[PDB]
């Protein structure tokens, strides 16, 4: 417990095991400084249709004529695996699986989407986002050109990512930061806050030491990163409202059971 560097290395090792596409690998792809070929670029209906079969997708069947609904369906497949990846990482945070099972669920329910939007920034530049484990690249303009309300989903995530990426965090930093987010003692409905705060205290101490060592020139980086937590909550809040426009005005679009459970009675 006393060694903060051992905690940082443990979290980083688990981070590498749980998340196939790290920021380091994503930056190597986005800057072309990698041995592998450039990603397939999806910028319109035709380029989506041409790269569609490389998008991971297992269902009953051909899903739809509409581009917006095609992306909506494929993005929710990714979100499901992201929750599964974050759950796997959460079980490696020291002390997490010793917590009440109901509190583990609660911490996941409120934490996963803040983590999803954090790690999306690793896959984004000002012009697009990497998809399918870096094999493809879907442009920001294309996502914004989708008919309402579909064109409004990704744009706030891009705006957050440009400012968040300016902090120049790396995978070692992000591994501790996402653990800090999961171990939030102020999530609604937590039964035993004190043991959760005890874990977050060490994670916060490890994060502060990690940022001072890895960014000795970035004064008050710890404070700037904690303030980004408030940006992530607006994204969640705005995203839930966008999902409700979908739920009231679009037809057949029922979310995956796991996503429905997370959003149900959320805030």
């Amino acid at each position: 417990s006393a060694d903060l560097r051992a905690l940082a290395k443990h979290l980083y090792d688990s981070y590498i095991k749980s998340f196939p596409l790290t920021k380091a690998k994503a930056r190597a792809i986005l800057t072309g400084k990698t041995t592998d070929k450039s990603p397939f670029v999806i910028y319109d209906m035709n380029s989506l249709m041409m790269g569609e079969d490389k998008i991971k997708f297992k269902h009953i069947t051909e899903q739809s004529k509409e581009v917006a609904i095609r992306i909506f369906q494929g993005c929710q497949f990714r979100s499901v695996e992201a929750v599964q990846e974050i759950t796997e990482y959460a079980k490696s945070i020291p002390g997490f699986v010793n917590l009440d099972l109901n509190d583990q669920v609660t911490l996941l329910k409120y934490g996963v989407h803040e983590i999803i939007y954090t790690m999306l920034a690793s896959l984004m530049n000002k012009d697009g986002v990497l998809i399918s484990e870096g094999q493809g690249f879907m442009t920001r303009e294309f996502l914004k050109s989708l008919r309402k309300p579909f064109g409004d989903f990704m744009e706030p995530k891009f705006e957050f990512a440009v400012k968040f990426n300016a902090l120049e965090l790396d995978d070692s930093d992000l591994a501790i930061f996402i653990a800090v987010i999961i171990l939030s003692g102020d999530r609604p409905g937590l039964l035993n806050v004190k043991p959760i705060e005890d874990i977050q205290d060490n994670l916060l101490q490890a994060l502060e030491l990690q940022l001072k060592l890895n960014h000795p020139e970035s004064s008050q980086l710890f404070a700037k990163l904690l303030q980004k937590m408030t940006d992530l909550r607006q994204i969640v809040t705005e995203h839930v409202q966008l999902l409700q426009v979908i739920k009231k005005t679009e037809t057949d679009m029922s979310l995956h059971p796991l996503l429905q459970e997370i959003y149900k009675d959320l805030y």
Partner: peptide
């Protein structure tokens, strides 16, 4: 439902 708890219990 208890889907989140299912991913937890491995």
């Amino acid at each position: 439902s208890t889907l989140l708890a299912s991913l937890l219990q491995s």
